[PDB]
Design a protein around this nucleic acid. Structure first.
Ligand SMILES: [K+]
Ligand SMILES: [K+]
Ligand SMILES: [K+]
Ligand SMILES: [Mg+2]
Ligand SMILES: [Mg+2]
Ligand SMILES: [Mg+2]
Ligand SMILES: [Mg+2]
Ligand SMILES: [Mg+2]
Ligand SMILES: [Mg+2]
Ligand SMILES: [Mg+2]
Ligand SMILES: [Mg+2]
Ligand SMILES: [Mg+2]
Ligand SMILES: [Mg+2]
Ligand SMILES: [Mg+2]
Ligand SMILES: [Mg+2]
Ligand SMILES: [Mg+2]
Ligand SMILES: [Mg+2]
Ligand SMILES: [Mg+2]
Ligand SMILES: [Mg+2]
Ligand SMILES: [Mg+2]
Ligand SMILES: [Mg+2]
Ligand SMILES: [Mg+2]
Ligand SMILES: [Mg+2]
Ligand SMILES: [Mg+2]
Ligand SMILES: [Mg+2]
Ligand SMILES: [Mg+2]
Ligand code: NA
Lengths: 158, 282, 173, 199
RNA sequence: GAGUACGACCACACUUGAGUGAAAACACCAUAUCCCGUCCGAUUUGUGAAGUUAAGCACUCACAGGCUCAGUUAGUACUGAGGUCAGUGAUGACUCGGGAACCCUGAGUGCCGUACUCC
RNA sequence: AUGAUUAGAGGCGACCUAUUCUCAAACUUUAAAUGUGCAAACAAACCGUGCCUUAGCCAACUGCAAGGCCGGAAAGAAAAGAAUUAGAGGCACCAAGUGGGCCUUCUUCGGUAAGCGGAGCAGGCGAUGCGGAAUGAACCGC
RNA sequence: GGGCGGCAUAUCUGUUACACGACAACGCAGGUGUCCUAAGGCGAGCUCAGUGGGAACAGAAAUCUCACGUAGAACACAAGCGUAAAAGCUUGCUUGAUUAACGAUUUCCAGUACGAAUCGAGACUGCGAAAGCAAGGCCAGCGAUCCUUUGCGAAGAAUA
């Protein structure tokens, strides 16, 4: 970039996708953000108020502050030899609930359910077997792999 | 030819259809987004809208909570339920709007269990008293949702609002749009508003139309019944009393008509038969 | 079903336009003439863009027009077509079901010619339609009118020559 | 005069077309890209002969014009002008600059060239089976005007179409082809059933 | 099996032609004293029920256009890593990995909630 | 789509509609490879009409929000290829030189080019010899 | 080389720039020192650029009317981005361009300042029926020490 304004070099970054223009939906308004929640900081191009800086687009952080119309997010930013915990202030339209701990939460819930079943004496689900093991292979149809003259005749255009 | 076709293939490729309810001309999404909006510091505490919709024949009043899966209607009142209380005609006038708002407020307060705690105005005066809101136990609060209706001085949406306010619910409002409010003087005439609420305008128009009839589309069903212009106010007063007495009452209480869809195989078979017939011709 | 009564063609409105072309005394007199003719207040139409050949400039009131509906519109149309001697040309009809004509002598419409004002002449335009065109002009649930429910040029011509018993020329240009 | 073309070979810069940012570009040397009977129908010229570039390089519009002029001269001398139709495929859209190492050395537009890839067809000639050797010799002489390495091949398609020579006659006789000028489109069983696409 | 009000996702829902639509709706519709607002009761507002499914609306269809999901294009284009590889070069291929796009072709043409109502 | 661009075709010459030749650093529907945030159980997270407080929210509380307290359960993180580590993590204080750089693979801009000028990722030389390419700061090996 | 020229000297947009961020050149294409009591704020209506059909003078182009029109128009000014019951156009009312307890942040960055910007908490308000929106015109449009100069510390009350 030739100048270093606040929104320099955001022509494609702060643009809406094809046929996906418009203001944020009601589902975004009705989302409940709590302090301590993991959120994704994704700028909505059509809001332009409370917009994050381009650096924080696509960053996931933890909410440290909720105001009537804004969200306080802590983002890690590497500066030289250390990482800084940057606190940014954005409107709720530029914030999304982050599924970064979805699999870990599911693992915890599955472990709790497994413990409950083991206490109740219910039969646990069968353990999956490794697909890397050996065995007999019975080929239903066997074909010959070879290079033909027709392959060369085809790869030549015109 | 000679005129460029605007709606060409590229035009349809690049078209972004609006939301279904916007393309149906039903919902103002800017207004809806501002109305369902709440402080993020509330963390999603319940917020209600007083949805007022008026058709050519009925008045629909609902108490609605916004949700991501879809709005939840807590309580609904209808103008066509008024005959159960004594309103046999004019279910779309200002008096019917006030009665529908009163009925919705009474039903909502009964369902929430706070009916005995909040009585509202027993006798309507048309007068404005400011609602008590957070911004002694506070009344149940809903905000008015007029949709796409034109908010003029004396519209029936504000009749429903006034009925709900007198029913016990606390809907934040100012009297600037009640009938009889004087824009120039910045004052409200409670007598004119009460006259509208009890439909003395309807009674006066009925008297005038009947006098002209003696000298018949208008008031045809009013005149078919033996409705007197001097009995309308008492009728609406009795309706108010009955609605307060028991809001839970209403009006006294699968052949397939769809056309089956052809499968893709049937469509292709029909198309092939048609092209084969054309080939046989030529 | 064409025999359905809702398909009857009615005169939606009559639009009378007097394009004086210059603001001032002439436009005031034209507004007075239109007030006498239409029995209602007319409106001045402001210039769109500056055209040197016509003067005109921009945002300057150059014409006075008015919309007439109901019985007054029908009687005004009767007077205007009486002036035209109940003869209209084929190309005077639009493809949208509407037609119009110009009147060159305002004093020919049964209006007194007291010389406080002068002879102006104007533009008559009538819009045919059918009961149901509300759907495309109402605020809520606004939607396009069905294609078949539209009034065509042939339908407008037949309506004109059946109701007012006028003569079409079937010419061009 | 003009610089030797060895200075403007090799495709070293990003494409630099004439636009609202690069004004002052002179017109390309080559103006007409079709010679011979360009209005001949697709059936008239079944043989297509290509000049295919084997190099990633730039070709000036001067070289393109010289090649087309040489090919036309040979075809009209050793044959008739109504028995062939040659098309120049490469278009000179890339602007060359001259700094006429110093400061502020960004140059001015002084020419235009076509950026050419490996396997890109440069010249295509529609002709008949009688005049194939004449077409080959004309395209050899036109190749002599181009920089880099090009090969001359005979296409497997009929004329300038994308329909194979062996199958074109059967497709046309069956009624599966639509004639739109000098190219044809295989009619597809789709869309509204009209007097077309009945097949 | 449908309708209405409020909706969520926002074309599998749009666009263009045609056809069909029980009940109840919805809507066209009638009207202008009052409330209100216009050049114009067209829009809007109030008041109302004589007519109509003609429009809207909803369904159905079209070897329809778009859209959506696939296949193909194609292990191609491109590409991370490697060579005291080839080639004057331009560039290529090879080795260990990743892997597209349009055209073209196949299938499909909304779905899911809350409340009330009709079958 | 926005910009350019060649030629035929079908409905004076345009105009219109289907195509067709050729393109884009300051075009793009689509879209890699390499990347780049966050998470992957010990101050944490999970469970409980559990209890206390609130001048926080909600029409209210048993609901939500926040600080705690008391208990529970803890593959200490299973099985599905289901990590690895010559993995002591943090926290300071006082100071030195340096702030002319050059070369190279790959990417890259200006220039006809240059042992030219200018950048990106990363390795080098500088500061480094040794063994190889006869010879060479930088290539190969180390 | 220097000089002349220019400003790459403070600064904004696109690109170079290699799909996070960052990146040079006297690289490319353009801007800034202003302008606006409305061109700020809000509410409500409405839809734009163009294209056809039609209507005295009137014609390619004056106004009127009906359709189609995904924005191809506008939004002071460069450029992106964004926006259609609006963020555009008309209109009505207004002074949220005022205060704002030394609240906390982003951008440049040494994680210093300045300039711009973001999320707030008070006061008094404006528009709106209301939910709400607004402490300027989103993002460029600006300035230390010292010195000068202006505003605020009304009146009254207190045996302190
Ligand atoms: K050659
Ligand atoms: K502002
Ligand atoms: K100063
Ligand atoms: Mg870019
Ligand atoms: Mg983007
Ligand atoms: Mg509104
Ligand atoms: Mg020489
Ligand atoms: Mg270059
Ligand atoms: Mg009407
Ligand atoms: Mg009406
Ligand atoms: Mg029908
Ligand atoms: Mg199709
Ligand atoms: Mg590579
Ligand atoms: Mg494991
Ligand atoms: Mg030094
Ligand atoms: Mg050097
Ligand atoms: Mg040194
Ligand atoms: Mg050696
Ligand atoms: Mg970047
Ligand atoms: Mg608005
Ligand atoms: Mg501070
Ligand atoms: Mg500052
Ligand atoms: Mg500014
Ligand atoms: Mg405040
Ligand atoms: Mg600005
Ligand atoms: Mg602002
Ligand atoms: Na100073």
């Amino acid at each position: 970039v030739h100048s270093y304004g606040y929104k320099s070099g955001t022509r494609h970054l702060f643009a809406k996708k094809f046929r996906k223009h418009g203001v944020p939906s009601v589902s975004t308004i009705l989302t409940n953000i709590k302090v301590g929640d993991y959120v994704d900081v994704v700028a909505d191009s059509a809001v332009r108020e409370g917009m994050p800086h381009k650096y924080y687009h696509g960053r996931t952080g933890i909410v440290w502050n909720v105001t009537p119309r804004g969200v306080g997010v802590i983002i890690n930013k590497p500066v030289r030899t250390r990482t800084l915990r940057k606190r940014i202030c954005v409107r709720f339209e530029h914030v999304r609930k982050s599924r970064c701990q979805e699999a870990f939460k599911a693992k915890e819930h599955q472990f709790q359910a497994y413990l409950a079943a083991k206490k109740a004496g219910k039969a646990l689900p069968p353990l999956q077997k490794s697909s890397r093991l050996g065995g007999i292979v019975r080929p239903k149809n066997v074909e010959v792999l070879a290079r033909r003259v027709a392959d060369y005749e085809a790869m030549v255009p015109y | 030819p000679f005129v460029k076709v605007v709606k060409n293939k590229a035009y349809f490729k690049r078209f972004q259809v609006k939301y279904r309810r916007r393309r149906e001309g039903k919902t103002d999404y800017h207004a809806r987004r501002q109305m369902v909006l709440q402080d993020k510091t509330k963390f999603g505490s319940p917020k209600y809208r007083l949805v007022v919709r008026i058709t050519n024949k009925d008045i629909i009043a609902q108490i609605v909570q916004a949700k991501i899966v879809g709005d939840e209607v807590v309580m609904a009142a209808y103008a066509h339920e008024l005959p159960a209380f004594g309103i046999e005609h004019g279910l779309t006038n200002y008096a019917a709007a006030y009665a529908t708002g009163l009925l919705l407020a009474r039903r909502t307060l009964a369902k929430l269990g706070i009916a005995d705690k909040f009585q509202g105005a027993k006798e309507a005066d048309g007068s404005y008293s400011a609602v008590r809101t957070k911004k002694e136990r506070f009344p149940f609060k809903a905000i008015l949702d007029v949709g796409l209706a034109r908010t003029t001085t004396g519209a029936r949406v504000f009749g429903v609002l006034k009925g709900a306010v007198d029913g016990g619910m606390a809907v934040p409002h100012r009297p600037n749009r009640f009938p009889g409010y004087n824009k120039e003087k910045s004052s409200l005439d409670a007598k004119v508003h009460r006259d509208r609420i009890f439909g003395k305008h309807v009674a006066d128009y009925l008297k005038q139309v009947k006098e002209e009839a003696s000298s018949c589309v208008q008031f045809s069903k009013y005149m078919a019944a033996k409705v007197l212009p001097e009995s309308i106010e008492g009728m609406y007063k009795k309706a108010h009393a009955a609605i307060r007495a028991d809001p839970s009452k209403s009006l006294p209480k699968h052949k397939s008509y769809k056309t089956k869809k052809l499968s893709g195989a049937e469509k292709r078979a029909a198309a092939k038969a048609k092209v084969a017939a054309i080939r046989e011709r030529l | 079903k064409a025999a359905n009564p809702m398909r009857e063609i009615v005169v939606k409105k009559l639009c009378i336009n007097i394009c004086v072309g210059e603001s001032g005394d002439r436009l005031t007199r034209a507004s007075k003439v239109l007030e006498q003719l239409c029995e209602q207040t007319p409106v001045l139409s402001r210039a769109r863009l500056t055209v040197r050949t016509f003067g005109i400039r921009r945002n300057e009131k150059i014409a006075v027009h008015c919309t007439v509906r109901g019985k007054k519109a029908e009687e005004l149309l009767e007077k205007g077509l009486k002036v035209k001697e109940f003869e209209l040309k084929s190309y005077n009809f639009a493809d949208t079901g509407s037609f119009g004509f110009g009147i060159d002598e305002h004093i020919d419409l049964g209006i007194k010619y007291d010389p406080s004002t002068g002879i102006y002449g104007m533009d008559f335009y009538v819009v045919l339609g059918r009961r149901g065109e509300r759907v495309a002009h109402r605020k809520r649930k606004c939607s396009r009118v069905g294609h078949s429910h539209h009034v065509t040029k042939e339908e407008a011509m037949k309506w004109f020559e059946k109701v007012h018993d006028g003569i079409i020329f079937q010419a061009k240009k | 005069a003009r610089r030797p073309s060895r200075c403007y070979r090799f495709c070293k810069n990003k494409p630099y077309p004439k636009s609202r940012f690069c004004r002052g570009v002179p017109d390309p040397k080559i103006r007409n890209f079709d010679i011979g009977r360009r209005r001949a129908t697709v059936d008239e010229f079944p043989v297509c002969i290509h000049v295919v570039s084997r190099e990633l390089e730039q070709i000036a519009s001067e070289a393109l014009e010289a090649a087309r002029i040489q090919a036309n001269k040979y075809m009209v001398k050793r044959a008739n002008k109504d028995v062939f139709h040659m098309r120049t495929r490469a278009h000179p859209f890339h602007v060359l600059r001259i700094n006429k190492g110093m400061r502020g050395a960004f140059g001015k537009p002084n020419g235009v060239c076509a950026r050419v890839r490996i396997g890109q067809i440069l010249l295509s000639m529609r002709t008949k089976e009688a005049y194939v050797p004449q077409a080959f010799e004309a395209l050899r002489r036109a190749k002599m005007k181009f920089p880099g390495r090009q090969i001359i091949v005979m296409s497997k398609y009929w004329g300038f179409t994308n329909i194979l020579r062996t199958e074109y006659e059967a497709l046309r006789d069956a009624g599966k082809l639509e004639q739109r000028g000098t190219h044809c489109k295989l009619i597809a069983p789709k869309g509204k059933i009209t007097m077309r696409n009945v097949m």
